[PDB]
Amino acid sequence: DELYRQSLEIISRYLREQATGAKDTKPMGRSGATSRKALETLRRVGDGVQRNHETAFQGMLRKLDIKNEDDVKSLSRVMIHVFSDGVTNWGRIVTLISFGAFVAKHLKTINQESCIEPLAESITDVLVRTKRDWLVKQRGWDGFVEFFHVEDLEG
Numbered sequence: 001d002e003l004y005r006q007s008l009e010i011i012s013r014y015l016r017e018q019a020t021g022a023k024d025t026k027p028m029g030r031s032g033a034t035s036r037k038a039l040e041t042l043r044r045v046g047d048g049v050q051r052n053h054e055t056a057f058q059g060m061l062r063k064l065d066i067k068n069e070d071d072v073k074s075l076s077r078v079m080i081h082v083f084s085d086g087v088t089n090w091g092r093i094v095t096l097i098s099f100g101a102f103v104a105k106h107l108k109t110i111n112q113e114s115c116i117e118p119l120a121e122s123i124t125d126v127l128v129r130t131k132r133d134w135l136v137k138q139r140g141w142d143g144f145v146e147f148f149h150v151e152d153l154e155g
């Protein structure tokens with residue numbers, strides 16, 4: 001399942017980067033060039049999303065009250081409720097992943113880094129297992145990269 005594998009790698013790397021502040025230097029798996037560009041795009045766009053929605057993100061994090069592995073496990077149900085049961089577009093997919101990064105950073109602050117990879121797996125499961133049809137139709141991660149591509153300015 002290439003789409004799942006690729007999704008997991010991109011989402012897992014971004015959440016880990018966000019939490020630890022360091023880039024993972026290991027090579028990507030299959031489709032490395034696209035996964036690299038997708039991660040680069042997520043960085044650029046996701047970092048802005050977390051700031052543009054700072055108040056809402058903080059509000060939701062407080063409401064969720066995440067303390068441990070049990071709370072983190074409970075998040076899949078909330079993601080299905082809020083993300084899956086709605087219109088699909090790349091903006092909403094970015095909010096899904098960007099809030100995940102926000103949560104991962106919170107997990108590092110409370111010294112619960114071990115829950116970050118499980119969280120990335122949960123997000124990937126929700127995204128891929130509930131929106132595969134849309135993802136395929138939108139050209140998957142190549143489409144994500146194409147959608148957010150910005151041309152260089154003249155001069």
Ligand SMILES: CC[C@@H]1CC/C=C/[C@H](O)[C@@H]2CC[C@H]2CN2C[C@@]3(CCCc4cc(Cl)ccc43)COc3ccc(cc32)C(=O)NS1(=O)=O
Binds near residue numbers: 057
């Ligand atoms: C119209 C702009 C929308 C962005 C602004 C939305 C803000 C919301 O008030 C909440 C702040 C976080 C947003 C809710 N979720 C996050 C979500 C549900 C809560 C648990 C959770 C846990 C993880 Cl680890 C990851 C995500 C979540 C589900 O993901 C999404 C996805 C899309 C939106 C909101 C959430 C959304 O409304 N996006 S928007 O339309 O771009």
